[PDB]
Amino acid sequence: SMSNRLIFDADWLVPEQVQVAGQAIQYYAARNIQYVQHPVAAIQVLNVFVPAAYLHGSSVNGYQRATAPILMPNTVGGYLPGPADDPQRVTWPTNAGTIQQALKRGYVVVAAGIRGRTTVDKSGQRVGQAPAFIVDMKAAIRYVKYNQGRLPGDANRIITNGTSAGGATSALAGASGNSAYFEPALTALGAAPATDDIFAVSAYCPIHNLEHADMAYEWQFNGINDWHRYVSGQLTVEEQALSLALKAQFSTYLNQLKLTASDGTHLTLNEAGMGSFRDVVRQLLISSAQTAFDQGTDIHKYAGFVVTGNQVTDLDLSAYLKSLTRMKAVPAFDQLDLTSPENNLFGDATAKAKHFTALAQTRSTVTAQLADAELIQAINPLSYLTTTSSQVAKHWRIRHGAADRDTSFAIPIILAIMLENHGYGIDFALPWDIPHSGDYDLGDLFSWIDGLCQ
């Protein structure tokens, strides 16, 4: 209620310790802080974790109570609800290991609980579909920033982190700082009166750009007709038909983005999906393989790589993709029968699911409505990156595994290039033979974070 003043009190922080493989990490914890005045669901609380040194007027890794980065990791995947995380958490989903390590590194951690597509209110009504996920994320950020003087850590040093849909969440938070679109929702919730722009973005396999993900997925995977996920199926003739068309539309969609390489060239595709853009994707995968190759990895686990001497000199992209195989059916995101996580994400309190593309709406196999166009745009990070603003984070780190079939490589790549083209800081890679996952590279994420702030 309005009785909740959203004022953090450091006296709430209580001492805890966790074993970190070979070390005891000392920290303080304050849990279950209601970060808005009018929450609609029990999941909307946040946890705060602070390196113990900061309660003692002491230091960690060059950081102190006033200056420490604030890592804001989330637990969201598949656009499902993400519970407030905890270094003591053993229940799925959780990044407790990442949190333990962040604390060891001197970062303040604010782990906020986030509504998702299956979330219901006290009346059994759905309250977690779009744009619930990002509203909650923003509200948590506002709580932190409103509480700058009282919450340990520098509120101007907030760095979000997430994997998959959580990566999209992290990316959207960075792109959309202080967007007016979300104001009515944040006001209806009674969020803290503060800004929600952040300092830096960490994103693993962000599942974003949903309205173009079907085109990208088929551009990558057309010609490979069996799919295998969690079960192993084969594409029907209808799906093969939709696939070939979806692939072609991607070229049109890609060319008009006017993406540029470092030399300033327009990155493009022809009617067959071949061209300088495809070449860029290939080079990032070659680069990925070389790094792995240099470490003594057997890259011929997958097909297509050409090795000359000690160098990966080329790659048969089609052979590689064939060996990697195919995870999702067609369309991969906007299912004609509305059965995808994203369909459900775009539903609302009346409709369990909606389409989010004209093609899938036109070809729907069930009665359906199309999601509001403004909403689709609003939850796409690219929407905010057509320009250089203050509200967009300056620093980005994006990772998508080179063995990851949850979305086309083109999706995170487009994001990275757009960020580069519009002058934002962007650190991008496709780490070799990494599955659907995140936080497997903390030494590098933390060195990157330290690089921005020290």
Q: Is 427 annotated as a binding residue?
A: no
Output the residue with the shortest Cβ distance to Hg ion. Answer: 205
Dist CA 448 CA 45 (whole Å):
29
Nearest Cα to 40, choosing from 227, 189, 206, 220?
189
453 in contact with Hg ion (CB under 5 A) = yes
406 in contact with Hg ion (CB under 5 A) = yes
Q: Minimum CB separation from Hg ion for residue 50, in Å?
A: 15
Looking at the Cβ atoms of 67 and 147, the one nearer to Hg ion is 67
Dist CA 377 CA 369 (whole Å):
17
- Do residues 416 and 398 touch, judged by C-beta distance below 8 A? yes
Nearest Cα to 304, choosing from 288, 316, 290?
316
Q: Which residues contact 330 (CB under 8 A, 6 or more apart)?
A: 214, 218, 235, 239, 240, 242, 243, 246
Q: Is 228 annotated as a binding residue?
A: no
Identify which range of 92-100, 111-119, 289-297, 430-438 contacts Hg ion by CB under 5 A. Answer: 430-438
Identify which range of 35-43, 62-70, 210-218, 315-323 contacts Hg ion by CB under 5 A. Answer: 62-70
436 in contact with Hg ion (CB under 5 A) = yes
439 in contact with Hg ion (CB under 5 A) = no
Q: Is 342 annotated as a binding residue?
A: yes
429 in contact with Hg ion (CB under 5 A) = no
Q: C-alpha dihedral over 420, 423, 427, 433, to 10 degrees?
A: -20
Nearest Cα to 209, choosing from 171, 244, 176, 181?
171
Identify which range of 240-248, 333-341, 343-351, 445-453 contacts Hg ion by CB under 5 A. Answer: 445-453
208 in contact with Hg ion (CB under 5 A) = no
375 phi/psi in degrees, rounded to 5: -65, -45
Dist CA 167 CA 354 (whole Å):
22
Looking at the Cβ atoms of 221 and 384, the one nearer to Hg ion is 221
User: Binding residue for Hg ion (CB under 5 A) from 64, 67, 119, 364?
Assistant: 67
205 in contact with Hg ion (CB under 5 A) = yes
Q: Is 439 annotated as a binding residue?
A: no
Residue 270 CB burial class (10 angstroms; 0-12, 13-18, ≥19): exposed
Interface mask toward Hg ion for 231-250; x: CB under 5 A: --------------------
Query: Which stretches of the chain bind Hg ion, using CB under 5 A?
Result: 67, 205, 404, 406, 436, 453
Residue numbers in the known binding site for 3,4-dihydroxybenzoate are 78, 165, 328, 342, 406, 436
